[PDB]
């Protein structure tokens, strides 16, 4: 009902349509990307500095670190939204790596529609310190996007890209795309 064809538009990038959204995967350093929103996969304290979270907090800078710990003490949050700091984005959405990945991605998509944003870049959420299995993480990310499209919710969001630290995890995402393709 939804899936287009898998192709490679640029070296190391793989893409397919999911309804009106372009879904892409690539390996690399997510802190070098430009998008309306970049997603961080962190702890329930929003102060982890290991793996992807280390790179994101160090690049973003100390004002973003302090925004995080200020919101964490105010209430119990499933995720938090901060400024971009010195990353090339309008906002960072910090999700909890150990939480249900489909739920986390659904929340990111909803928040981006609320701001009329068009582009999102995320890591392989949960595959770092949280040690969720890559096969289950890929299935959950793509399922969230399918559900969002099926419900008629995609209006401003046009591009969702997963930038993945390890090439071996990229292989798992590409196999999942080929399983789904029209
Ligand atoms: C070798 C291993 C311990 N490093 C990591 O897990 C890791 C993850 C994401 C990164 C993003 C930018 C830069 C370095 C990064 N390193
Ligand atoms: Cl994680
Ligand atoms: Cl990753």
Curated annotation (Swiss-Prot):
Job of this protein: ADP-ribosyltransferase that mediates mono-ADP-ribosylation of glutamate residues on target proteins. In contrast to PARP1 and PARP2, it is not able to mediate poly-ADP-ribosylation. Has been shown to catalyze the mono-ADP-ribosylation of STAT1 at 'Glu-657' and 'Glu-705', thus decreasing STAT1 phosphorylation which negatively regulates pro-inflammatory cytokine production in macrophages in response to IFNG stimulation.
Residues of the full protein shown: 1208 to 1388 of 1801
Factors inducing expression: Up-regulated by IFNG in macrophages. Down-regulated by IL4 in macrophages.
Residue span, Macro domain: 10-181
Processing after translation: Auto-ADP-ribosylated.
Subunit structure, as described in the record: Interacts with STAT6. Interacts with PARP10. Interacts with PARP9 in IFNG-stimulated macrophages; the interaction prevents PARP14-mediated STAT1 and STAT6 ADP-riboslylation.
Residues holding a glycoprotein 3: 29-30, 41, 52, 126-130, 165
Gene it is expressed from: PARP14
Tissue specificity comment: Expressed in macrophages.
Family label: Belongs to the ARTD/PARP family.
Domain of life the protein comes from: Eukaryota
The protein's name in its UniProt record: Protein mono-ADP-ribosyltransferase PARP14
Source species of the chain: Homo sapiens
Protein location: Nucleus; Cytoplasm
């Amino acid at each position: 009902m939804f899936y287009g064809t898998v192709s490679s538009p640029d070296s190391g990038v793989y893409e397919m349509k999911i309804g009106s959204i372009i879904f892409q995967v690539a390996s690399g350093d997510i802190t070098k990307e430009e998008a309306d929103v970049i997603v961080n996969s962190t702890s329930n304290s929003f102060n982890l500095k290991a793996g992807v979270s280390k790179a994101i907090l160090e690049c973003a800078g100390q004002n973003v670190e302090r925004e995080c710990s200020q919101q964490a003490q105010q209430r119990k949050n499933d995720y938090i939204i901060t400024g971009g700091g010195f990353l090339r984005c309008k906002n960072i959405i910090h999700v909890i790596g150990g939480n249900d990945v489909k739920s986390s991605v659904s929340s990111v998509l909803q928040e981006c529609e609320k701001k009329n944003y068009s582009s999102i870049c995320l890591p392989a959420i949960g595959t770092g310190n949280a040690k969720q299995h890559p096969d289950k993480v890929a299935e959950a990310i793509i399922d969230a996007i399918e559900d969002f499209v099926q419900k008629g919710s995609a209006q401003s969001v046009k591009k969702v890209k997963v930038v993945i630290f390890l090439p071996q995890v990229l292989d798992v995402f590409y196999a999942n795309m080929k399983k789904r393709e029209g």
